[PDB]
Amino acid sequence: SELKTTLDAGLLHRGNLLQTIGDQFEQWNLLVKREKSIYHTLNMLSLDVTKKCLVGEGWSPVFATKQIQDALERAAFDSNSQVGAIFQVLHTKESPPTYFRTNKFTSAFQEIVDAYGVAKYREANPGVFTIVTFPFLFAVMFGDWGHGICLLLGTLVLIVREKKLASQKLDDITDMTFGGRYVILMMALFSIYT
Amino acid sequence: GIQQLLAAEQEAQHIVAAARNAKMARLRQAKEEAEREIAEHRAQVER
Amino acid sequence: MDHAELTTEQVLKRDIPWETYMTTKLISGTGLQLLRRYDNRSESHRAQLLDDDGPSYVRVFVSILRDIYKEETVEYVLALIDEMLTANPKRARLFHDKSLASEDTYEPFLRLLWKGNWFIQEKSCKILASITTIDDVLKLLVEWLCAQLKKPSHPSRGVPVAINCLAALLKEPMVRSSFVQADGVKLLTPLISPASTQQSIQLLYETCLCVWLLSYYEPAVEYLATTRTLPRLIDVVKSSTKEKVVRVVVLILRNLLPKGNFAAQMIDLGLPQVVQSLKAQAWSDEDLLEGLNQLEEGLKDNIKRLSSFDKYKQEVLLGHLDWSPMHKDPLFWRDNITNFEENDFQILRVLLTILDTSSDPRALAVACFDLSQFIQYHPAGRVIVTDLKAKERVMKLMNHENTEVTKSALLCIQRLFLGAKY
Amino acid sequence: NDADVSKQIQQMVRFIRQEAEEKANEISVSAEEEFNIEKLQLVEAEKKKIRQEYERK
Amino acid sequence: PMQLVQIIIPIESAHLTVSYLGELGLLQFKDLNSEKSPFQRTYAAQIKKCAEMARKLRFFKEQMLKAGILSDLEVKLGDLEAELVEINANGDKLQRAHSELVEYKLVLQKA
């Protein structure tokens, strides 16, 4: 009985400690992710001891580079360093991969269309036309104004519950369906019109 | 840029080399000077 | 220096027509003509005029500029004099000549101290550079800082400019010994941790290099012993990323390392852990890393002395127990068990009473950790602790607040517990 | 140019100030202190030996 | 329309600059230094130490999850994990002692 009481007390103390240990590990997960990102940057990008700085080059959006580099330099200066980071541009004959900016609703359609590939930094983007073309064609194959209402209603609940849906996980097929709620709603509206 | 940054590094390396030589120079100079001073001090004992 | 150059710009930009003031009798007419020649010594060197070759002509002009008290008039000449000592082409020799001639040195002394803050900084810079007992006397607790620093900022506006004057004195050992008699040492330790400057390393590096020279002087070593937060000032310098700034803090610490003070730093500030943290910190200089290894070696010798005190139960006697590395370490703990049991655990029994009631929960926790070491080596030692009521206190102490007290008490409760039931 | 040349000159100034004012100054002052101490450390022993010889005489 | 950007982040704030850049994120990392392997490389040894710390933190998190917990920093996490492991070992030893004593009590009562 004494040994069981001691074991119970030790287990209770361990659980009480783990209650805060898990809370600390919650933020430690993001800390470890940031450390891993910095480690990948260090192992991938070299540095100059003569410059006593980490230097390199990489692709960046011109619009983003208009403010991101300045913000990084300002943060480096605010980090009590003797001098902030650089913001110089670089040029090369190679064509870096690039992605067009994705909106909150256009993201799903853009991802669906991009499953065939990508293009140059500012080349043709068939996603712009197909964002409405696919609803403009998939409606005909299912044109019946008694079921399109049902499809829209089913999509509508997903859009409404999006606040809770974004947090709670679901089935893999269910998650894939919820990923394109706006596209599903647009297709349902087109089908209702058809 | 890179060449401009390299000049500061070369100057720093030259200053480092000068500082490194300064140690031996000062050590030898002080040794000789204090040998003369110690000889004078020992001569004072004779007086 | 850029900081010297920015102050030198403010003066040489603004122009001063001496000959008008000379007619008013503010300045000598010959001196007014000399002041223009001294500034244009470089132009004379370009013309290859014989005037440029002669140091005395510039030195006489420098003496007239030094005599002027108004900051603007003096600066338009003092900045030229500072440029002259810096530039070989214009009045390179005059600076050495001014010190050599008694009258020119006296004129710099008149310019020194009481002067416009920009001029006082400029005057207290040429006088400081060799190219002096009087300069050492001019140094005082207020110093040129009463004008070079943020108070009366004018153009110099910087404690570091005043610190640069102090750094110049550090070079003469007797002057540093004289500066040790002067106060402001406590202010200097906080000031050495300057955090705001165009270059972070520049703000503290000038103070750091001087501190290494200060360590060498024995009277200044006595002043250093009085100074507190020395580990904190070194820790802030270690926190500064520049390897050289940290290395100067480390070089000063190594040169003035007192085994007792270093042991105190190891016991309270974890100086040995800081040496490991020095390896953790990136260091460009090989010497800085070599010094950190040297610091651990010296810390290890201090730890051996601490181990003898732990066996002696010196802390037990004072009732002023503290964590220290050897007591926690198992090999030292195994020898300590017998030492703690001096006679029927008599030394341990005093510790058990201290564990039951301690001035701090952490102090009781330190006693509980030591009790866990002794209990592991000998079961009978725990029985004596139960008689002292230390064992009864441990169970309540696990419930008691404080992370150190709760963790140590939980270990003590489990340590007894493992043995009661097999 | 512009920000790039400003960063270049800032890097040059920072490097020269860190290597010269912070590090090279440390080596120079350490060398000076060693010069002060080391040979006097033997001058003391030489003086003691001279005193012993004078006592014998 | 992206483009190349070349910059230098001083070692005095290289970690801070990397953290600030990762707060928002604009430019993908390069791959020039990747040919040197996790063996030293530019800072892969430091990356190796960070990876070891992350592995220790992951082991601690897995232990906490096994315990039903709810979710210098690396050193603190390792110390907490060691304390939890010691507490679990003490509890297991006490439970084993209780089981042995209960078995002995049952045998003695039957005898």
Curated annotation (Swiss-Prot), chain D:
GO terms for molecular function: proton-transporting ATPase activity, rotational mechanism. Keywords: Hydrogen ion transport, Ion transport, Transport. GO terms for cellular component: proton-transporting two-sector ATPase complex, catalytic domain. It comes from the Eukaryota. V-ATPase is a heteromultimeric enzyme composed of a peripheral catalytic V1 complex (components A to H) attached to an integral membrane V0 proton pore complex (components: a, c, c', c'' and d). Belongs to the V-ATPase E subunit family. Subunit of the peripheral V1 complex of vacuolar ATPase essential for assembly or catalytic function. V-ATPase is responsible for acidifying a variety of intracellular compartments in eukaryotic cells. This is V-type proton ATPase subunit E. It comes from Citrus unshiu. The lineage of its organism: Eukaryota, Viridiplantae, Streptophyta, Embryophyta, Tracheophyta.
